[PDB]
């Protein structure tokens, strides 16, 4: 909408207060004009017709329970935009400042979130498996990263290419969580998963097998559930990324960590320069090795650690 840029205040899903960029034109809208061509947050009103209505508020204060998922979707989309711009010199998901759209209150009891080809979509959860999923910065950044992938490598959402697609979203979701630096970890979705259970997560990158996901290529899933295991086999790549950053000895193979910033540079370059829609795990290893070579040199520690990490997870 056409209006003037304003700053509202509200509370997110976890009860924390934050300032949000809004737009005033009769109502105050969840429309942040400070980032690219805007960040826009919509109310899906418990229905499945998208996007719903651009979120309107009478007073620029967003403290109602119903407001909380919208506050966090809007705010964390902004943090994710800032990460890509400041860290990778990427302007929104298309590289040309495309408007970022999200809808909250999607459906009823909806235990998921997704990128639908055009926008982000967040369920509220059923209150037992999940609380509203936009409360997780890693989840929000995971979703926006699907848009980045779709505009760049274009990894097809099945089998190995789809597991790479998923891992890319978990990797950058985690790197955005570290960028914001509020309780960061290598777990996925801990802030919104299972409100009745402390200390669990939807996935772990440091130890995928904690939640049943493989941590070695020999343990990959080969069936047809979950688009050929895209959220399962992502554990193999998530573990390799964790090892590149943090180091460790895994199945007897030792990896010297090189830190998060270098992990992010290597995988961002691989995603945007070398991966293709049909890349498999072996091709990802080659892309990551080449990316590290470009950035740091063929004889560098960084290249050596990429190779060790993929060796540790059984990917040649
Ligand atoms: C219990 C769940 C929260 C776990 C998991 N989801 C995630 O980890 C995050 N959502 P996501 O990975 O973005 C879904 N995304 C997904 O299933 O994409 C299918 C699609 C393709 C094209 C258009 C619309 C949807 C899942 O779906 O099993
Ligand atoms: Ca209000
Ligand atoms: Ca965390
Ligand atoms: Ca996390
Ligand atoms: Ca929990
Ligand atoms: Zn995903």
As to burial, measured by CB atoms within 10 angstroms (0-12 exposed, 13-18 middle, 19+ buried), residue 58 is exposed
Residues 144, 212, single domain; the answer is no
Domain count of the fold of the chain? 2
| Best of 164, 231, 234 for a ligand 1 pocket test (most atoms within 8 Å of beta carbon) | 231
Binding residues: 57, 59, 61, 138, 142, 146, 166, 177, 183, 185, 187, 190, 193-194, 197, 200
What is the maximum span of the chain, computed from C-alpha positions, in angstroms?
Answer: 64
Can you say whether residue 212 is alpha, beta or left, with left for phi > 0 and alpha for psi between -120 and 50 degrees?
left
Please tell me if the CB atom of residue 112 comes closer than 6 angstroms to any atom of ligand 1. yes
This structure was determined by X-ray
Are the C-beta atoms of 105 and 124 separated by less than 8 Å?
A: yes
Write down the residue that tokens 């059923």 correspond to.
126
Residues 304, 164, single domain; the answer is yes
At a CB cut-off of 8 Å and minimum separation 6, what does 182 contact? Answer: 137
Domain-embedded: residue 1: no
Distance of alpha carbon 109 from alpha carbon 126, whole angstroms: 4
Write down the residue that tokens 């979130």 correspond to.
113
Q: Which atom of ligand 1 is nearest to the CA of 112?
A: 3
Expressed in Å, this structure's resolution amounts to: 1.2
The domain containing residue 96 runs over which residues?
Answer: 6-154
The residue among 100, 123, 154 that closes a domain is: 154
| Best of 106, 109, 112, 163 for a ligand 1 pocket test (most atoms within 8 Å of beta carbon) | 112
Backbone angles phi, psi at 287, to 5 degrees: -65, -40
Backbone angles phi, psi at 203, to 5 degrees: -145, 160
Measured CA angle at 184 (ends 92, 76), to 5 deg? 35
Binding residues for Zn(2+): 142, 146, 166
The residue among 123, 154, 185 that closes a domain is: 154
Are the C-beta atoms of 58 and 27 separated by less than 8 Å?
A: yes
């Amino acid at each position: 909408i056409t209006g003037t840029s304003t700053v509202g205040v509200g509370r997110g899903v976890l009860g924390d207060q934050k300032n949000i960029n809004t737009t005033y034109s009769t109502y105050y809208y969840l429309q942040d004009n400070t980032r690219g061509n805007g960040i826009f947050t919509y109310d899906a009103k418990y229905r499945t017709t998208l996007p719903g209505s651009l979120w309107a508020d009478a007073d620029n204060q967003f403290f109602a329970s119903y407001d909380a998922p919208a506050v966090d979707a809007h705010y964390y989309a902004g943090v994710t935009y800032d990460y890509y711009k400041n860290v990778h010199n990427r302007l929104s998901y298309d590289g040309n400042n495309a408007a970022i759209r999200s809808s909250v209150h999607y459906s009823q009891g909806y235990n998921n979130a997704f990128w639908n080809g055009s926008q982000m979509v967040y369920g509220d959860g059923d209150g037992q498996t999940f609380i509203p999923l936009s409360g997780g910065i890693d989840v929000v950044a995971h979703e926006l990263t699907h848009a980045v992938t779709d505009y760049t490598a274009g990894l097809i959402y099945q089998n190995e290419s789809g597991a790479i697609n998923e891992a890319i979203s978990d990797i950058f979701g985690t790197l955005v969580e570290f960028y914001a630096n509020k309780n960061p970890d290598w777990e996925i979705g801990e802030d919104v998963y299972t409100p009745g259970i402390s200390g669990d997560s939807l996935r772990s990158m440091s130890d995928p097998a904690k939640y049943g996901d493989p941590d070695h290529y020999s343990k990959r899933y080969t069936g047809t559930q979950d688009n050929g295991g895209v959220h399962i086999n992502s554990g193999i790549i998530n573990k390799a990324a964790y090892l590149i950053s943090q180091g460790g000895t895994h199945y007897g193979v030792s990896v010297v960590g090189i830190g998060r910033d270098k992990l992010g540079k290597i995988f961002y370059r691989a995603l945007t320069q070398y991966l293709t829609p049909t890349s498999n795990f072996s091709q990802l290893r080659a892309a990551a090795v080449q990316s590290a070579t470009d950035l740091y040199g063929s004889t560098s520690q960084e290249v050596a650690s990429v190779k060790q990490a993929f060796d540790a997870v059984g990917v040649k």
